[PDB]
Amino acid sequence: GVIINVKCKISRQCLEPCKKAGMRFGKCMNGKCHCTPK
């Protein structure tokens, strides 16, 4: 589990860097981004 405290706006804009790192999941909850490692 890897949470990051960034003002996100679209789940797709946090999905890109979460893929770059290598995450199985890329989800934003209106506020902060929550990605899960693969």
Side-chain angles (χ1 to χ4, degrees):
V2 172
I3 315 318
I4 57 175
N5 304 71
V6 180
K7 178 183 296 304
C8 77
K9 194 175 190 298
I10 47 157
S11 56
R12 180 260 178 79
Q13 82 188 109
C14 294
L15 171 56
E16 288 60 89
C18 291
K19 180 273 179 299
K20 183 182 177 65
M23 299 277 181
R24 187 180 289 176
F25 304 162
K27 291 290 299 97
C28 193
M29 294 291 118
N30 180 22
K32 301 172 177 62
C33 279
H34 286 241
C35 295
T36 65
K38 177 162 183 301

